[PDB]
Amino acid sequence: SLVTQVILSADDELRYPTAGELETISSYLKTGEYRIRLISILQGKEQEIIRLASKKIFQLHPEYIAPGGNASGARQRALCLRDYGWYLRLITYAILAGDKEPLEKIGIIGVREMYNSLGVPIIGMIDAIKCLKEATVEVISQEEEDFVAPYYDYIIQGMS
């Protein structure tokens, strides 16, 4: 989370948190429930969104769905929606703890070697998350989707 980054970043200098950092905790905690209210909106639309993600990741990339591709077959596609479910679940964690570590300690750190040992094309997974961010805009209004927009494209930046 954000307080953890301040306690850590202040701990390697052997000092208490300064004036600016205590702002960064205080301002983060005052915007508390709005992340809490937002994640309940997204949890009610996880079956909403991943159905829309499978819309365009496969019409864009029929290579993976076709016989021979990695996602060919039922059970391969079955977990395919599961990876969207874990990613969307991770983003609800990142939207709450207002930073990137739950998207980075999980999911991002070492993701390429995971997929490369699986056969999933790592470029395709970048479009999958980009597809997932494209899908979240429809079930979300303009007020709060740019609140969740910077959490998505960090994942794309992490995967390249």
Partner: protein, 173 residues
């Protein structure tokens, strides 16, 4: 480094005086465009991996020599994919430190972390300085394609990329 603010405060500390209103007017000009400086930065994070890709093809479409053998001058252009891999990596940096420096509203982060020894490093590896600067402003035109209907975002985007251009030049005039 130093943002526009800390650079302003050091301006008044050297003279040892409090912040007058001419000093505060400089700070207010940052606070007005500060909200506009972010979606410029937020657009770059969303357009980062793309904006390097359009810059490379727009570069090599005019400099096909950079994708060719060097000549006997052992010069580092994008000849091999090992050369091409690292050479795209430099475009990462020019977009990155020119992205922070858009938010700081001041080129202090640019010269001390990019410019200092840049001609040093490229003269060692014999790297192109000419094409290296041209790709920096191919990014500038590419980024300004998005914010184009008005023209006060344009001066903001131009300031980091224009600073690297004037400073990486061997001065002809």
């Amino acid at each position: 480094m130093q943002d526009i603010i800390t650079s302003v405060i050091n301006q008044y500390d050297l003279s040892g005086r409090y912040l007058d209103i001419k000093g505060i007017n400089q700070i207010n000009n940052y606070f007005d465009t500060g909200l506009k400086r972010l979606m410029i930065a937020k657009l770059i994070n969303k357009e980062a991996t793309n904006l390097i890709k359009e810059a490379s093809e727009l570069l090599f479409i005019e400099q096909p020599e950079l994708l060719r053998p060097c000549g006997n001058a052992f010069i580092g252009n994008a000849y091999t994919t090992r050369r091409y891999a690292a050479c795209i990596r430099d475009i990462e940096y020019y977009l990155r430190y020119s992205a922070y420096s858009i938010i700081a509203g001041n080129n202090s982060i640019l010269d001390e972390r990019v410019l200092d020894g840049l001609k040093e490093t490229y003269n060692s590896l014999l790297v192109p300085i000419g094409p290296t600067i041209r790709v920096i402003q191919l990014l500038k035109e590419i980024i300004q394609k998005k914010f184009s209907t008005e023209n006060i975002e344009n001066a903001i985007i131009a300031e980091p990329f224009d600073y690297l251009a004037i400073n990486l030049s061997d001065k002809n005039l």
